[PDB]
């Protein structure tokens, strides 16, 4: 009854990059309370 | 598309592009 | 607000006829609100 | 449909199978060497869907009518 | 746009057009000096 | 101190409608609708202490 | 007989530049270390 | 027979808003303890006196 046809070209190109970098350094003050400031400002 | 058989031609062309940039810097 | 609607019909025969409507409407609303509060205090104490 | 089925590239899909539902079209697809045949679904001839399911980007296909229509050489070239 | 004509003949001609534009710009500035 | 606040809205719409049917062994209909809206809102505040 | 013809054309160009720049300098001179530091925090005291 | 029906729309919106909020304060003290001076001269915006 019917004949059905097609064709074509598909293209995808991707570039994706994510960088996360945190430094939290505390010099001076006691180990515990400098560590507390290092962890949670 | 034409009919007297009935017969069709269809054409498609597309370019879909997406770009995103997100930069956060904080120094204390 | 205004509505202004007019209508005319005509026919003539030994044949031609016209029936016709044209009408136009206007609406307006202005709304106004205003407030002004002013005040002063002095206090001199010795 | 009762189609030839080859979900994986097969340059001469002769794998006729009794997916013998009556009223519905088959698929033939040629993507160069990447030739495919399926007990496809009727009510379809969408290039984007074929590229999706068959994972092919240059393919040529027919949604050929009803039963046994879809032997591998029905696509010329 | 929509056009039709006929006699035995038919001739249908439709058109659509859209030109939608959005243009937004917000700025905030704060200067806070304490001494 | 003074605290001052103004608020204004002007809403206007204008519309036109037309119909015209004619018969003279040739038949015709003709119709036009035209609508215009202009809407303005202004709010103004000055506060001094 | 019938012959039909048609075109659809479409564009959606959308751009969304967004930026924040925040500079805070705190200077504290004199007093005890404890108060000097907590004054040197980023919030007003 | 011949028929033709033609439509146009042309909506437009334009909004603009500006704020300026300037606050200035200069508590000044002579005399009294340095700590009471700094405590009192520190401007509390909810109670500026
Ligand atoms: C221009 O067109 C857009 C898209 O239709 C309009 O945004 C719609 O507005 C209605 C009424 O406010 C909302 O119900 C829809 O949810 C909106 N759609 C989107 C995707 O935001 C916009 O209002 C139009 N602009 C003008 C000035 O008429
Ligand atoms: C930092 O401290 C706050 C307040 O005590 C708390 O709500 C938060 O969860 C803490 N976060 C971390 C990582 O310790």
Residue numbers in the entry:
A (entry chain E): 368 to 408
B (entry chain E): 215 to 218, 239 to 262
C (entry chain B): 395 to 408, 412 to 443
D (entry chain G): 1 to 77
E (entry chain D): 194 to 200, 215 to 242
F (entry chain C): 200 to 248
G (entry chain D): 346 to 390
H (entry chain C): 349 to 397
Can you list sentences taken from the study reporting this PDB entry?
CD59 is an abundant immuno-regulatory receptor that protects human cells from damage during complement activation. The membrane attack complex (MAC) is a human immune pore that ruptures lipid bilayers to kill cells. MAC assembles from the stepwise association of five complement proteins: C5b, C6, C7, C8, and C97. Though unable to bind soluble C8 or C9, CD59 directly engages both proteins within the nascent MAC to trap C5b8 and C5b9 assembly intermediates.
To understand how CD59 blocks membrane insertion of C8α we solved the structure of the C5b8-CD59 complex in a lipid nanodisc. Using 3D classification of images we resolved an equimolar complex consisting of a single copy of C5b, C6, C7, C8, and CD59. To improve the resolution of the C8-CD59 interface we subtracted density corresponding to C5b, C6, and C8γ and focused our alignment on the region of the map composed of C7, C8β, C8α, and CD59, enabling us to resolve the central β-sheet of CD59 and unambiguously define its orientation within the map. In the C5b8 inhibited complex, helical bundles of C6, C7, C8α, and C8β are fully extended, with CD59 directly binding the leading β-strand of C8α TMH2. While the curvature of the first two β-strands (TMH1) of C8α is templated by C8β, the geometry of the second β-hairpin (TMH2) is influenced by CD59. CD59 binding bends the trajectory of C8α TMH2 30° from its membrane-inserted conformation, thus preventing the tip of the hairpin from puncturing the lipid bilayer. Within the C8α-CD59 interface, the C-terminal β-strand of CD59 forms a contiguous antiparallel β-sheet with the MACPF domain of C8α. The interaction is initiated by a salt bridge between CD59:E58 and C8α:K376, which is located on the leading edge of TMH2. Next, three consecutive glycine residues on C8α (C8α:G375, C8α:G374, C8α:G373) encode flexibility in the strand curvature and enable the β-strand bend observed in our map. Aromatic residues of CD59 (CD59:F47 and CD59:Y61) fill the void created by the first C8α glycine bend.
